[PDB]
Structure 1
Amino acid sequence: QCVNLTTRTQLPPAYTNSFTRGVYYPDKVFRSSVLHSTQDLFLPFFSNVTWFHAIHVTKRFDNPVLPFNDGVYFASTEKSNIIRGWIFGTTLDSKTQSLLIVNNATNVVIKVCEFQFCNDPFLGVYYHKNNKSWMESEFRVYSSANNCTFEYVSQPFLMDLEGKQGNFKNLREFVFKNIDGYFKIYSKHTPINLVRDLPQGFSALEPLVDLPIGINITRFQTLLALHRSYLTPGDSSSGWTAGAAAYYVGYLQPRTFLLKYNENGTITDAVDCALDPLSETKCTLKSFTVEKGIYQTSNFRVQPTESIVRFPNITNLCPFGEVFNATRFASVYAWNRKRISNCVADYSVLYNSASFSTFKCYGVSPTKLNDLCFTNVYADSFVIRGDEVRQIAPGQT
């Protein structure tokens, strides 16, 4: 396993709302001059997400383990390249197929193995006194990788990272969704220019590359980088700088937006179909111009809460010893009818003696027996052979 830090000042984060962000292309079909609806995972407008911080020239560096849900909207405002890669898995202990997509300064290591992570994985760089670049020295991601299922190596590229401080310069948004075997990644770059806060602009995210793999993602964790200059000792005690960045963590919800396609085919406007009474009218009428009148929408329904059961109290068990697994029964033409009533009947206790080999219920579901009440349960006991079981069916001659 990797190492950890010492004395982490975790400040209570704040909460921010969305500003028309989290809209992408649900399908790969070109559509223009058409207004309709699409049922897909998106981020609802004017929601409430957790706003994390990482400003440090204190000791603001927090990266908890958040559970992964169906559709996670991640928007990081990197002005000096602090947030590197991300991890996806369940227990993170070399016991399941985990996803490791780290944005290394040399290449993009995308491997699906069984890595071993510590308590707080991160990246470590060094600031040389003679070289003004930002090269990577420490590598505290994993420890070993034996069984693997996928490996991807990017092309060699030269990237000396960024040192810009003050205001934000680049915006990197990533959407991670787990749909069966397709892992869609929507990456979109937008050169923003502001101090802080989420921009109020509207843009459509484009997919990068789909990974047809079969992994089980339950929890994720955002990995960052630490700066170690010559003024700091460079140890894992107090000689480390968190940096200066901020990322937004949001979860997608099954909503429905009103996509607007112009002559170029890009998404320029999105109106929610279930949030405000005014925005719902635009989606229902399939038009952005609402006239002055009266309209009819949904009705009024109340969902129930508890569920009471009113069954008669019966403290008697039906004799399953003489009916099932006995000594002898009757013939096929002289079968005897036994009345079974005034007792509690159940089919789950019929496996302790004489395991059944053919249990096919006709006219009733085998799992819906205990749901409905039984009344006048007659048993037809007869001993036959195996060549006559196929003929016993309601509708055979």
Structure 2
Amino acid sequence: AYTNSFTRGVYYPDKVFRSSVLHSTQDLFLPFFSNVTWFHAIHVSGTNGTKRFDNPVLPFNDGVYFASTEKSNIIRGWIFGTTLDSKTQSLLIVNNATNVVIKVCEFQFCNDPFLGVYYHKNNKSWMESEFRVYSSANNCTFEYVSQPFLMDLEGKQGNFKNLREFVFKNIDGYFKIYSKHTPINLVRDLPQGFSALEPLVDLPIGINITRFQTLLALHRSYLTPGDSSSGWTAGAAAYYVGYLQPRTFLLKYNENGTITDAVDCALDPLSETKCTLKSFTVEKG
């Protein structure tokens, strides 16, 4: 639906360091308290409660913010591309066994490009059982893969505690990804806390993108009667999507150099004052 992002979308576009000072800089930040779309990776199993199949195509207008409150560890990747077809080159992200398999390999993006995890019997743990994501011409001009083969599911059904935040932004094709891993406790909505967003990698493939979608897992164990897409009852997370807009903001660094608080320049009158004065606090006048 529509939700209030209290303070999310703050990061370091410049690699430089400033201690215990402020800096007014213009960049594709996410406007504060803007409309944020809430998507609900939940498996309501009531006979009159439809399976919440929250996976439509989302517009990649300027730069995509992304927050994921996941503790079931189901929401995985990001599907990119203007045409979302094998004809025009595109980008795809997947995170299988803590392995990012970023590729320009524009496969077929039919309505089931998803993962599926099943609790196997040969080994008593949820082992990957579905890879229905790729079947098309490869013709890959780029292939980057880091290969740490681990797993950190730690699925909980009651309280959300792990929040992963990512911002994907394109600048002259240097497709930058900024990431943050936060142990949280709020279950209802995004906590009213301040957290920077360190960059992860700027993939310089220079791919022309307008479309954006999300990647999760859909298969389930054997105790649930039925099949993967017909019966699924372990997706128990949520995520939120906002769109960055071209704005000038202000950042208040600390001695260490971590962004403790930001101030929009175009939110409110007091915000404008704290902007133009180049000060985090202003006296009467």
TM-score by length of 1: 0.67
Cα deviation code 1:7-41 (max 9, x no counterpart): xxxxxxx2111111111012011112332310111
Residue by residue over 1:368-396, the C-alpha shift from the partner in whole angstroms, topping out at 9 and shown as x without a partner, is xxxxxxxxxxxxxxxxxxxxxxxxxxxxx
Distance in 2 of aligned mates of 1:129 and 1:60? 28
CA gap of 1:237–1:54, structure 2 versus 1, over 3 A, is: closer
Give 1:169 shift: 1.6
SS of the aligned residue for 1:281 comes to: helix
Give 1:204 deviation, angstroms. 0.8
Q: Where does structure 1 differ by over 6 angstroms across 4 or more consecutive aligned residues?
A: none
* 8 A Cα contact 1:181 1:212, kept in partner: yes
Distance 1:146 1:288, change over 3 A: closer
Asked if the contact 1:228/1:234 (under 8 Å) is kept, the reply is no
Structure with max Cα Rg = 1
Q: What is the deviation of 1:237?
A: 5.3
Question: What are structure 2's unaligned runs of at least 5 residues?
Answer: 45-49
How far apart are residue 149 of structure 1 and its match? 0.8
Q: Residues of 1 paired with 2:175 and 2:226: CA distance? A: 38
**Distance 1:24-1:160 versus aligned 2 partners, 3 A rule:** closer
Distance verdict in 2 for CA 1:261–1:81, change over 3 Å: same
Given the superposition, is the C-alpha separation of residues 233 and 143 from structure 1 closer, same or farther in structure 2, using an over 3 Å criterion? farther
- The residue that corresponds to 1:281 in the other structure is 273
Q: SS where residue 21 of structure 1 aligns?
A: coil
Q: Which moved more, 1:173-182 or 1:109-118?
A: 109-118
- State the shift of 1:258 in Å: 1.6
Aligned to 2:101, what secondary structure does the other structure show? strand
Contact 2:252 2:280 in 1 (8 A): no
Percent identity of paired positions between Structure 1 and Structure 2: 100
The separation in 2 between residues aligned to 1:265 and 1:214, in whole angstroms, is 31
Question: Using the alignment, how far apart are the partners of 1:41 and 1:103 within structure 2?
Answer: 26
d(CA) in 1 for partners of 2:98 and 2:6?
A: 35
Q: Shift of the alpha carbon at 1:241? A: 3.3
Label 1:277 to 1:93 Cα distance change in 2 as closer, same or farther (>3 A): same
Per the TM alignment, residue 165 of structure 1 is displaced from its structure 2 partner at its CA by 1.5
Q: Secondary structure at the match of 1:174?
A: strand
Quote the residue 2:47 is aligned against. Answer: none
1:317-342 CA distance string (max 9 Å, x none): xxxxxxxxxxxxxxxxxxxxxxxxxx
Distance 1:105 1:131 in 2: 16
Runs of 5+ consecutive residues of structure 1 not aligned to the other structure: 1-13, 293-397
Query: Quick check: 2:129–2:219 contact (8 Å CA) kept in 1?
Result: no
CA contact (8 A) 1:72 1:252 kept: yes
C-alpha change, 1:129 and 1:181, in structure 2 (3 Å) is: same
- Indicate conservation of the 8 Å contact 1:123/1:138, yes or no: yes
The alignment partner of 1:278 has SS state of helix
Selected match of 2:92 from 94, 100, 121: 100
When residues 189 and 160 of structure 1 are mapped into structure 2, their CA distance, relative to the original with a 3 A threshold, is closer
1:206-242 Cα distance to aligned partner (Å, 9 max, x none)? 0111111121111111111124111234535522336
Q: Pick from 95, 110, 116: which aligns with 1:124?
A: 116
Q: Which deviations, in whole Å up to 9, do the C-alpha atoms of 1:255-291 show, x marking residues without a partner?
A: 1222112211111111111111111111111122222
**Are the aligned partners of 1:227 and 1:243 in contact in 2 as well (CA < 8 Å)?**
no
Residue 54 of structure 1 deviates from its aligned partner by: 1.6
* CA 160–282 in structure 1, closer or farther in 2 if over 3 Å, else same: closer
Q: CA deviation at 1:160?
A: 5.1
SS in 2 for 1:251: coil
Normalised to the residue count of structure 2, the TM-score between the two structures is: 0.92
Q: 1:260 to 1:266 in 2, by over 3 A?
A: same
Is the 8 Å Cα contact of residues 64 and 168 (structure 2) preserved in structure 1? yes
Cα distance in 1, alignment partners of residues 31 and 25 from structure 2: 14
Tell me: higher relative CO, structure 1 or 2? Use CA pairs within 8 A at least 6 residues apart. 2
What SS does the corresponding residue of 1:155 show, helix, strand or coil?
Answer: coil
Separation in 1 of the partners of 2:148 and 2:7? 36
Shift of 1:156: 3.6
- How far residue 106 of structure 1 moved from its aligned partner, in angstroms, is 6.2
Deviations 1:167-211 (A, max 9, x none): 112110010001112011001101001222011100111011111
| Equivalent position to 2:155, from 147, 160, 163 | 163
Instruction: For residue 236 of structure 2, give the secondary structure of its aligned residue in structure 1.
Output: coil
Q: Once superposed, what is the RMSD of the aligned Cα atoms?
A: 1.8
* Alignment counterpart, residue 261 of structure 1, candidates 253, 258, 268: 253
Equivalent of residue 220 in structure 2, options 206, 215, 228: 228
**SS at 1:280 equivalent:** helix
* Bigger mean CA offset, 178-187 vs 53-62: 53-62
Do the aligned partners of residues 242 and 119 (structure 1) sit closer, same or farther apart at CA in structure 2, a change above 3 Å counting?
A: farther
